């Protein structure tokens, strides 16, 4: 069962200062957001949908005893893909860097300001991997960004 | 949810002589394997993911008592699509040729060597359908990759 939650708002999504630690308002354009509605294997998209659902639930509904586990139990599968965290658990088991859901990295254009879709920062031995060990992935992301810019 | 397992390794996938019967090593290019990450209704992709998961589990995790039922039950949904085998079950019920995931066919370019994504061989009366009765299908396949040859 694929998720069906669509992100609110030109066409991008903005993470407010509350959803980020030690950071101010951040914003991502329409191109980056549009990938969240098509791909089933992005952790940032899942967490972004979770944050959007939390915000909408707070605004639209009331509050009472904060025992809202029923609401998330009803709509757990409409926001995230459980097989993604399952795959991360398998990668953790096999002694391989996995997707701790805390940190993310992305590529910023120096002048245009265009931003790629953030990818989660891999961790191993309980410590964050250092970019000398996944520079190839960053180069691949830059190549994909250039190719998208061409069209 | 949907499957999240990604196939290992330019960019293609090679089945060793142990994964096939009465055959040698067989490689498939990037242009065919890349379709396995978006199509939700490809039988060969699901079986190839199963084989890759088995190989990685043998290579990395230890083997003892061979009671790996917990491991496969834990990550069955991250490798295959249950609705595919359900659809095959319904097609078998309705007296229509179905697929038991044993035999596959593909198209070779005699000179170039590029191939298409294998499709599984249908079965009736507990016997394989013969090439005439799905020849049209094969034709379509060729046309498709001919279009892929255009770009």
């Amino acid at each position, epitope marked *: 069962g694929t998720f069906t939650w669509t992100l609110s708002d030109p066409g991008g999504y903005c993470l407010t200062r509350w959803m980020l630690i030690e950071a101010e308002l951040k914003c991502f354009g329409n191109t980056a957001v549009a990938k969240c509605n098509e791909k089933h294997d992005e952790e940032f998209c899942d967490m972004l949908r979770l944050f959007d659902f939390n915000k909408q639930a707070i605004q639209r509904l009331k509050a009472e005893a904060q025992t809202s586990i029923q609401l998330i139990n009803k709509a757990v599968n409409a926001l995230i893909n459980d097989q993604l965290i399952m795959k991360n658990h398998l990668r953790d088991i096999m002694g*391989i860097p996995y997707c701790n859901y805390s940190k993310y990295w992305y590529l910023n254009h120096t002048t245009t300001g265009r931003t790629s879709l953030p990818k989660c920062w891999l961790v191993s031995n309980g410590s964050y991997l250092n*970019e*000398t060990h996944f*520079s*190839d*992935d960053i180069e691949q992301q830059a190549d994909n960004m250039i190719t998208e810019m061409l069209q | 949810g949907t499957f999240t397992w990604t196939l290992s390794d330019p960019g293609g996938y090679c089945l060793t002589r142990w994964m096939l019967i009465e055959a040698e090593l067989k490689c498939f290019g990037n242009t065919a394997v890349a379709k396995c990450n978006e199509k939700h209704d490809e039988e060969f992709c699901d079986m190839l993911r199963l084989f890759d998961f088995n190989k990685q589990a043998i290579q990395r995790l*230890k083997a003892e008592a061979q009671t790996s039922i917990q491991l496969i039950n834990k990550a069955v949904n991250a490798l295959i699509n249950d609705q595919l085998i359900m659809k095959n079950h319904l097609r078998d019920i309705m007296g229509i040729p179905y697929c038991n995931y044993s035999k596959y066919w593909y198209l070779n370019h005699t000179t170039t060597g590029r191939t298409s994504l294998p499709k599984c061989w249908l079965v009736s009366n507990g016997s394989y359908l013969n090439e005439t009765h799905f020849s049209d299908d094969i034709e379509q396949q060729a046309d498709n990759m001919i279009t892929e040859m255009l770009q």
Partner: antibody
Amino acid sequence: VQLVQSGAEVKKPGASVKVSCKASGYTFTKYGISWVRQAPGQGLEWMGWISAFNGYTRYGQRFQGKVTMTTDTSTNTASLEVRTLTSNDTAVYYCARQYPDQYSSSGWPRLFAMDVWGQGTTVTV
Amino acid sequence: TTLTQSPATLSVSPGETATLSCRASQNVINNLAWYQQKPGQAPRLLIYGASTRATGIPARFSGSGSGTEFTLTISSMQSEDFAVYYCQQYNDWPRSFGQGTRLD
């Protein structure tokens, strides 16, 4: 493509040794440098690995503090510094080129070995 | 992880094959390297990976094995093949070299 380790030199125990290996024929910032020590009559022994991209260092278990690695991308040079010398520290030091291990979310780890080696630099106390 | 070589020496006449063994402490999936070191020369990479030859290496050398157990086979051992052979694992840090066996 080869690496040159600037000949060799010897000194009395207690001093410091600075061994330099210069890389050429390839892009320096894409490959890190590993250091291997071979005692006279003994086998090879791993010391450490420094990435030329940003300077990230992995040190040996018994070489932290005693041995330091530095890099200089301006002149394509890797440097190895030893502060304390001992009768058993006499050896031959080899500078080798190694690609950093690569990891990705959609993929599997790709690990690398030492591709090319420079001529050894001998140190006797 | 510490890995050891079983023969530790090999007095073999030229002409016939030579077999070298390498045993690993833990599991090392196809992440092995075989180097050769001539007398008074820097080591050079012979085999990278379990069974893959480096560029410019003659087909006489061939690696095999996986997991814990690895082997190296030389078909036509010649005069230029008299060196010291080293087994290294690069599956995890720190990188570990073998004790090395001398082929004379």
